Amino acid sequence: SQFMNLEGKVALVTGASRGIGKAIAELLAERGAKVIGTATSESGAQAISDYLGDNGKGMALNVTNPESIEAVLKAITDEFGGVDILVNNAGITRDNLLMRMKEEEWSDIMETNLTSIFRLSKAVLRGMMKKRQGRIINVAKAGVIGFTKSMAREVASRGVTVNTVAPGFIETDMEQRTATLAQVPAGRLGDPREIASAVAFLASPEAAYITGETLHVNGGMY
Amino acid sequence: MSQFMNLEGKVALVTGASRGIGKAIAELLAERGAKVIGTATSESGAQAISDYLGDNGKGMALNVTNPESIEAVLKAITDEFGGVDILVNNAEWSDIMETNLTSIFRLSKAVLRGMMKKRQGRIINVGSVVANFAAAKAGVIGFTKSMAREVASRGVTVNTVAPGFIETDMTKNDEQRTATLAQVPAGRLGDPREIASAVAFLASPEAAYITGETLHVNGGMY
Amino acid sequence: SQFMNLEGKVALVTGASRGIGKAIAELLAERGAKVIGTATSESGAQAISDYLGDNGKGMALNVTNPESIEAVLKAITDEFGGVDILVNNAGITRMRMKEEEWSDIMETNLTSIFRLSKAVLRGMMKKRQGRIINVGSVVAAKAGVIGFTKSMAREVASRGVTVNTVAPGFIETDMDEQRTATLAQVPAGRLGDPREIASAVAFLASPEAAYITGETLHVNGGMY
Amino acid sequence: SQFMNLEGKVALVTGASRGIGKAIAELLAERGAKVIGTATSESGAQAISDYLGDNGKGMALNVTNPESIEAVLKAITDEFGGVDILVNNAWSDIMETNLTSIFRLSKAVLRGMMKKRQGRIINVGSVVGANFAAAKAGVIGFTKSMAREVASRGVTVNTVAPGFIETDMTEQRTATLAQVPAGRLGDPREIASAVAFLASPEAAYITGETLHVNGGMY
């Protein structure tokens, strides 16, 4: 039906090889989007191509490298058209033990988690604003929420919305679980499909009047 | 049609459903398969709701300020349709406190015993459309978050949808219109269908891990 | 010195008989404010008068009652001048409960804030000078406090009045080894002291905080 | 009095030669801190020495250079003691480089503070006057991550986020002002007040926070 229909929309999903990212790309495809997901390797890309099938493809992308970003977007633009939906989900959620890390390892954690969001968002934004139509959904640092709301204010008048989905404890591959559960009023972990549901809602034409929002999907955790 | 955002088999009670935001909510819930009972203050209100719902539901007269009306309306619903699965509360200091805040609490409390026994329920409080406006919203939000914490573990979510400037009769002068619009980064009024979309998202099985949330549908306004 | 000096400022602190409220009132007085704290009873009021001494007094106030509010403010205005600083701290930190008990919890926790803030605001805005500081609960249902603060801040900013929230975490109040359970949630690894909530409030109440409004200042050991 | 008293505290304030940075260093000195401010040149350093007088001194520091950082800190440690308060003040390259200095300086002073169970790190965002959102987002992210990691050892890490402050950068004045609900620019002394509050013993239970000093702007 016409309800939450993404047919004719080109969606780029970063970090799409498993868990939350793969749920997002699959659901966006189920709702009619043409989906391009990314992984850090070619076998990651290929696996994304496998599960998307005719609904999209995978591409290898290093979020920290402006050359990779520029090439990946050219490839997308040539084959599919300008990006209409951008889901920034790439992140190395890798034991931030800041005090003990080397400066170059710390540069990489920041470029991957934060700077990449800015770079990707900036690159797709020109097209969306020219079109008067776009969705950027950021799924890293707590600076993400600030960046979302600042960018949302700036681009709202040109038909582009910018929103954050903030997950709680989601069941990924990563006992002492009962310890975690006690912090969640719903008393259970989230399913990655429930983050994807939120993202997909925000990506729809029906969410055109929601921008600058943080959608918490966390079992009541606040 | 599909299993996505499917409310088939769900009984929804929508208060204040005779026009605008309330009627958009009830219609969309019906489109997605819900059995919808909307309410108005009069029997001709009720009858007009019956008219537009058709086989997908009915209208009933309800005075939210009266515990006797509330108890009768729910008995009638329970007998004919089953227990309520989805409740949409849509409707100076005395006005705010007593009328709004108390009715919401009473209705929510009455449907909650069933939902918690079932381990399944949705309560969605819709704030009013943009002195005491900030106070009325503060109150609804405080009730949402307190009640969400208490019932989350028993499979019931409680959320607020906070509208900005939505196009209704009240908002329809030219000086004053263009004055309002300037405060909205999206540069246009909201459509009642967009408040309905948000409510229906929160009412779905897919939104099971969202509770205690305020979903602003306001073109970036706050 | 001239730094964080509240001399010549009339400060009304609700719920000032103990803990957070009394620390706020004492510190405001230390920094030169003329402080009126409130309790629900006259013996509450008298005890507040005792610990304030020459720096202020206690008055009986029921925050849920528009008559009590109007009387308490008249009494303050006549004797001290218009209120310059308002600390909304009153709150009963005590559900399938009866609906009238629930009405009371909301009127006392939230509606009172709106009523007191509104009452003192005419004077402050005429003066182009005022501080309203809402102190959130330490433990709920005050969650609307942050929204109200920000809406109200936007509206009155241009007339020289700031409106801010101080949001406490786990503070050591009157309040076993179920304590270690609480502590585990706090990255600083200890409870807050009521003097630390008071330090925050007094900062926000100073002339130096004139350009901060619409803020929530979390005093919670890193908790969120 | 004992209220907001920084006596016996050693404060390092980067970019301290003018505006916000100079207001921060002067206020910290007023409240009793022994203050070391920094500039990019030796004449910057000397001008900081001039206005601090007996309350501190200026040193030349290049924040982008690990050798300068290590030398400046040794010199400070030898003469004054470990740094108790650190105020980090004053497009892809600009963000990587500025964010990197903050991390390096903070990391260098942190070993001492955590051994002491006492420290304040206050990161001051740049003044509003696009990529600006990116630079702020980064400082805020670093603040909150680092704050979580060191909180248990008595150190707090906080951001002060200024709006439109009256400085040299700041007829289009009126254009800017319209965006500020308070209807006026901030004074650098008001950013300094905020920093000094966060640097006090009284703010020991505030960490991971962004304190906006912006006339209601957000």
Coordinates of C-alpha atoms in Angstrom, one line a residue, chain C residues 1 3-4 27 31 150 153-154 157-158 170-171 186-192 196 199-200 202-203 207-208 210-224, chain D residues 1 3-4 27 31 148 151-152 163-165 179-187 190 193-194 196-197 201-202 204-207 209-218:
Chain C
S1 CA 33.9 40.3 47.2
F3 CA 32.0 37.6 43.0
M4 CA 28.8 35.6 43.3
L27 CA 24.1 29.1 51.0
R31 CA 26.3 34.9 49.8
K150 CA 13.0 25.5 28.4
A153 CA 13.2 30.4 29.4
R154 CA 12.6 31.2 25.7
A157 CA 14.8 35.7 28.3
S158 CA 14.5 39.1 26.5
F170 CA 21.4 10.3 44.2
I171 CA 21.9 12.8 47.0
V186 CA 27.2 6.4 39.9
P187 CA 30.5 6.7 38.0
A188 CA 31.9 9.1 40.7
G189 CA 31.2 6.2 43.1
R190 CA 29.6 8.2 45.9
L191 CA 26.4 10.0 46.8
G192 CA 26.0 13.7 46.3
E196 CA 26.5 20.4 46.1
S199 CA 26.3 25.3 45.1
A200 CA 24.7 24.8 41.6
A202 CA 23.5 29.6 44.0
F203 CA 25.7 29.8 40.8
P207 CA 24.5 38.0 38.3
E208 CA 27.4 36.0 36.7
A210 CA 22.9 36.1 33.6
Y211 CA 23.6 34.6 30.1
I212 CA 22.6 31.0 31.1
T213 CA 19.0 30.2 30.6
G214 CA 17.1 27.2 29.5
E215 CA 19.7 24.9 31.0
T216 CA 19.5 21.7 32.9
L217 CA 22.5 21.5 35.2
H218 CA 23.0 17.8 36.2
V219 CA 24.6 17.3 39.6
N220 CA 24.9 13.5 39.5
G221 CA 28.4 12.1 39.6
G222 CA 28.4 11.3 35.9
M223 CA 25.2 9.2 36.1
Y224 CA 23.8 10.4 32.8
Chain D
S1 CA 35.9 32.8 52.2
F3 CA 33.4 29.5 48.8
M4 CA 34.7 28.9 45.3
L27 CA 39.2 35.0 37.2
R31 CA 39.8 33.1 43.1
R148 CA 33.0 8.3 32.4
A151 CA 35.0 9.9 37.4
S152 CA 35.8 7.2 39.9
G163 CA 27.0 31.2 22.1
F164 CA 27.7 34.5 20.5
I165 CA 30.3 36.2 22.7
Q179 CA 18.8 34.7 17.1
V180 CA 19.6 35.3 20.8
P181 CA 16.5 35.3 23.1
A182 CA 18.4 37.3 25.7
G183 CA 18.9 39.9 22.9
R184 CA 22.5 40.6 23.6
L185 CA 25.9 39.1 23.2
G186 CA 27.7 37.4 25.9
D187 CA 30.6 38.9 27.7
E190 CA 30.5 35.2 31.7
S193 CA 32.4 32.5 35.5
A194 CA 31.0 29.3 34.2
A196 CA 35.5 28.9 37.3
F197 CA 32.3 27.3 38.8
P201 CA 35.6 22.0 44.8
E202 CA 31.9 22.7 45.0
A204 CA 32.9 17.9 42.4
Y205 CA 29.8 16.0 41.6
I206 CA 29.3 17.5 38.1
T207 CA 31.0 15.6 35.4
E209 CA 28.2 18.0 31.5
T210 CA 27.9 20.6 28.8
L211 CA 27.2 24.0 30.3
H212 CA 25.7 26.3 27.7
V213 CA 26.3 30.0 28.2
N214 CA 24.3 31.3 25.3
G215 CA 21.4 33.7 26.2
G216 CA 18.9 30.9 25.5
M217 CA 20.1 30.3 21.9
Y218 CA 20.0 26.5 21.3

